[PDB]
């Protein structure tokens, strides 16, 4: 510790100098000849209601039709977005769920919360009633996010500053990703399911490797807690929403700052971040009851999604990109197209 | 409307019915968040209310107690890290926050004051009333009667403090005990009545370990909280 601190400081200085030398021109002047997105107007095509307490998590399905929503009344509801029909109202043992995931195959739904347990529910079962398939209890802190990897592996970030890749069939924790000093708030899987980024309570996001968990990269550009994270569609970049009322677009294999999405009249922190189908639009939900839409390549607001009383706390974009569904703390889901 | 679509809608309505049955139970019960450090007799209070009226790394422990045929669901955190910045936002819709404070020891008294200040002035925790419990008044009685620990050592303002005229004396209590007890209560109330502006209100109590009236006190304070909320709906407050 006598010289380890100094060595770490000088190594960080060297990394910063390398990053500075690696930056020729920022994204501002690179995308200077691109025509603007052009004042996107989006309206509430669907309004989904039936949750009692605040809706705190949601996740779109791969078919872009069914979406799962987890609300703090201990309720897990799968909605058919087209007909606004709710399927599989799943009751939870712990009414403090903070995250929900929908398996890519659509056969399982994950939910976790303050009970330190990730419950995997089997949607398609012979008996016909949804039941808990597997309870994963290895974390010592609240589960903030969870994402299905291959219908048998699940990556869950907890409040004990650790991520964990599990093995649902055996119920044991396969790999543990450590390195965060603050509790991890969100995680996003890469399109190829070989990488994933995690944003925690520190000013840093970490790109890990699911195969061995050796934590390739760390990006430090924010100033407060990072509440949301999501890759670009191509998997070579990701956007982070933090608590300092700013969004930031980092790029893999460059370790750089591409864009900062913020405005002077914005003071509430970001809560959820998602991308459009082509990655041109970045949909960010805020604590001022809005879902400001940004042009990713030009960093200017393109549209605002009103109609929510409390904070949004969750939003997702369909795999085909037809619609965007935003939850809220007023217990109402809004689907926009 | 296809025949398959008819069944899908019919299943949803048979879902809607269950959700309506669940809403009857969710609204009947009042959820209470129980805070407090390790020194406070939080576990003793939990045990007292659990026995009186009706898992290795669990993050939340839930106890439900029914008084006057109304149910209260009280949650205290278990295996959670000391950083409460994030998971405290999950309790924005609780009826009240039971803030138990060990009034005996003073090495961490100011820590409890800072915890109360942080809870009070929180954007997502505003409009939530706190049922402040000043537990273990007996231990404070012996500690202040022996005259071994001086209050002005930790809080210098105790020297220029006198018991308020509105303070109700406890029979058989020495004036020094009452003065110190009400000094602690007023020290908490000073933070309480500084930014609430009628949105939320604090309910101090001089609880002990022997006493069994904690459930009744919580019931009365929750009744007052809901009455104030309903009056605020009419903008009467």
């Amino acid at each position, epitope marked *: 510790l006598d010289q380890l601190r100094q060595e770490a400081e000088q190594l960080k200085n060297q990394i910063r100098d390398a990053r500075k030398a690696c930056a020729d021109a920022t994204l501002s002047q690179i995308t200077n000849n691109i025509d603007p997105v052009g004042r996107i107007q989006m309206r509430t095509r669907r309004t989904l209601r039936g949750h009692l307490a605040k809706i705190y998590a949601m996740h779109w399905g791969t078919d872009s039709r069914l979406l799962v929503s987890a609300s703090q009344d201990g309720k897990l509801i799968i909605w058919d977005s087209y007909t606004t029909n709710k399927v599989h109202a799943i009751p939870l043992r712990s009414s403090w769920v903070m995250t929900c995931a929908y398996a890519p195959s659509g056969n399982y739904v994950a939910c976790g919360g303050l009970d330190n347990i990730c419950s995997i529910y089997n949607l398609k079962t012979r008996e016909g009633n949804v039941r808990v398939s597997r309870e994963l209890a290895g974390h010592t802190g609240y589960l903030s996010c969870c994402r299905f990897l291959d219908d048998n592996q699940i990556v869950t970030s907890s409040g004990d500053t650790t991520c964990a890749l599990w093995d649902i069939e055996t119920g044991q924790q396969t790999t543990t990703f450590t390195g965060h000093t603050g509790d991890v708030m969100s995680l996003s899987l890469a399109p190829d399911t070989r990488l994933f980024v995690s944003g925690a309570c520190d*000013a840093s996001a970490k790109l890990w490797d699911v195969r061995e968990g050796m934590c390739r990269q760390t990006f430090t550009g924010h100033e407060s807690d990072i509440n949301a994270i999501c890759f670009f569609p191509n998997g070579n970049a990701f956007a982070t929403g933090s608590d300092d009322a700013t969004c930031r677009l980092f790029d893999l294999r460059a370790d750089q700052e591409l864009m900062t999405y913020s405005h002077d009249n914005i003071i509430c922190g970001i809560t959820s971040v998602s991308f459009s189908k082509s990655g041109r639009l970045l949909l960010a939900g805020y604590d001022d009851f809005n879902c400001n839409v940004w042009d990713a390549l030009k960093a200017d607001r393109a549209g605002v999604l009103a109609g929510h009383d409390n904070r949004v706390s969750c939003l997702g974009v369909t795999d085909d990109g037809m619609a965007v569904a935003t939850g809220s703390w007023d217990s109402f889901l809004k689907i926009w197209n | 409307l296809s025949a398959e679509d008819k069944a899908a809608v019919e299943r949803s309505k048979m879902i809607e019915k269950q959700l309506q049955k669940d809403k009857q139970v969710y609204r009947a019960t009042h959820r209470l968040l129980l805070l407090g450090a390790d020194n406070s007799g939080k576990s003793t209070i939990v045990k007292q209310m659990r026995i009186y009226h009706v898992v290795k790394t669990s993050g939340i422990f839930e106890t439900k107690f029914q008084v006057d045929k109304v149910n209260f669901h009280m949650f205290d955190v278990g295996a959670q890290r000391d950083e409460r910045r994030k998971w405290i936002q999950c309790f924005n819709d609780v009826t009240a926050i039971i803030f138990v404070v060990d009034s005996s020891d003073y090495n961490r008294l100011q820590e409890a004051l800072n915890d109360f200040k942080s809870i009070w002035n929180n954007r997502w925790l505003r409009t939530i009333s706190v049922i402040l419990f000043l537990n273990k008044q007996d231990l404070l009685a012996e500690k202040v009667l022996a005259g071994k620990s001086k209050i002005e*050592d930790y809080f210098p303002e105790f020297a220029r403090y006198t018991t308020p005229e509105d303070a109700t004396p406890e029979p058989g209590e020495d004036p020094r005990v009452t003065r110190a007890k009400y000094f602690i209560r007023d020290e908490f109330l000073r933070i309480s009545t500084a930014s609430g502006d009628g949105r939320h209100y604090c309910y101090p109590h001089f609880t002990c370990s022997v006493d069994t009236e904690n459930a009744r006190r919580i019931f009365n304070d929750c009744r007052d909280i809901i009455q104030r909320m309903h009056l605020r709906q009419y903008e009467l407050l």
Partner: nanobody
Amino acid sequence: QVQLQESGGGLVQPGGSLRLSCAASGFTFSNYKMNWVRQAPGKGLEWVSDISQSGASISYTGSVKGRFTISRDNAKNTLYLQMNSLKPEDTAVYYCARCPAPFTRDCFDVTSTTYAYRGQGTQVTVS
């Protein structure tokens, strides 16, 4: 990234004055409520003082009401703590901590262990 560097503080006679400086980098200083905490040997983290944005809400803990003062310079990106008269009891490691979530009134878990937005700290020994 956010980094807080503490300077000053060390061996001092019981009655001297020490100035503790804290240089902040990686964030907009004026938008956060800066703090000052201490950890005595074997006593754990203990809150000492805090100051809101651009001052105007200076507060202290009971033990140092009349001795310690806290100021900040947003232009110089710095937070200062002046200790006019030291006692042998308050020898400790002092940490310049920063509240999270700018533009806020509360300040959560600053005294919690492994706080992210906290400096390395400086040792102050009084004897």
